Amino acid sequence: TLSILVAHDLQRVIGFENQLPWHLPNDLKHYKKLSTGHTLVMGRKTFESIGKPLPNRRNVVLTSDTSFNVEGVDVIHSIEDIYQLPGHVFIIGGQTLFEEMIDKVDDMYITVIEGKFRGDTFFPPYTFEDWEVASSVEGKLDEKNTIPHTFLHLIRK
Ligand SMILES: NC(=O)C1=CN([C@@H]2O[C@H](COP(=O)(O)OP(=O)(O)OC[C@H]3O[C@@H](n4cnc5c(N)ncnc54)[C@H](OP(=O)(O)O)[C@@H]3O)[C@@H](O)[C@H]2O)C=CC1
Numbered sequence: 001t002l003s004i005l006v007a008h009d010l011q012r013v014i015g016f017e018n019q020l021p022w023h024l025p026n027d028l029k030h031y032k033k034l035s036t037g038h039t040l041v042m043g044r045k046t047f048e049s050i051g052k053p054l055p056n057r058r059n060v061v062l063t064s065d066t067s068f069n070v071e072g073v074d075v076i077h078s079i080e081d082i083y084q085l086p087g088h089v090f091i092i093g094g095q096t097l098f099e100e101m102i103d104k105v106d107d108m109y110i111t112v113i114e115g116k117f118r119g120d121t122f123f124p125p126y127t128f129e130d131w132e133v134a135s136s137v138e139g140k141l142d143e144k145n146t147i148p149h150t151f152l153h154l155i156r157k
């Protein structure tokens, strides 16, 4: 199966100057959980901002740069390449990837940040008519997680 995994605010902002405008450990913990034992696909400029890759899951990068051959990471160069990848595959960003993939994924896992942050990169608009709300869970807030957030699981009708 093919899923989107994203965190966006109330105006679908996802990043500002190449990092997440917010910091929310519980999203990261939530993000962390589902990814384990699966494939993750990202645009070069997303991987760039992480540098250090994630343990215990197949990290794949999409770039047209054949020249890049960075240690311990699989490379692809087109969308077709994605179709030919076993197991459960996750689209993790960034924008230009989400834009391309939103109409191809089976379901979506969205953390909705209940706020309005300044951003320069966005998640594509989408209507609930196309999307069965399979689940909706309010995130708990403590001292380390100060921002209201909702974990959604949207499935295409
Ligand atoms: N809130 C969230 O859940 C997340 C937010 N972000 C945010 O996203 C922002 C980055 O967004 P964006 O600029 O879109 O970054 P991307 O990682 O999506 O960079 C896009 C790159 O992917 C490659 N690419 C995309 N499509 C193709 C294709 N069809 N064929 C070959 N290569 C392709 C290109 O690389 P190349 O030119 O080398 O070929 C392109 O430059 C950051 O600000 C970051 O903070 C990122 C992930 C998650």
Ligand SMILES: COc1cc(-c2c(C)cccc2C)cc([C@@H](C)C#Cc2c(C)nc(N)nc2N)c1
Pocket: 005, 006, 007, 018, 019, 020, 023, 027, 028, 031, 046, 049, 050, 091, 092, 093, 109, 110, 111
């Ligand atoms: C090292 O672990 C990361 C750290 C950051 C990071 C943070 C949290 C703050 C400042 C700068 C950076 C680079 C970003 C990520 C990216 C890959 C992601 C993601 C993502 C998340 C967090 N949630 C949902 N739902 N989808 C997502 N694709 C991973």
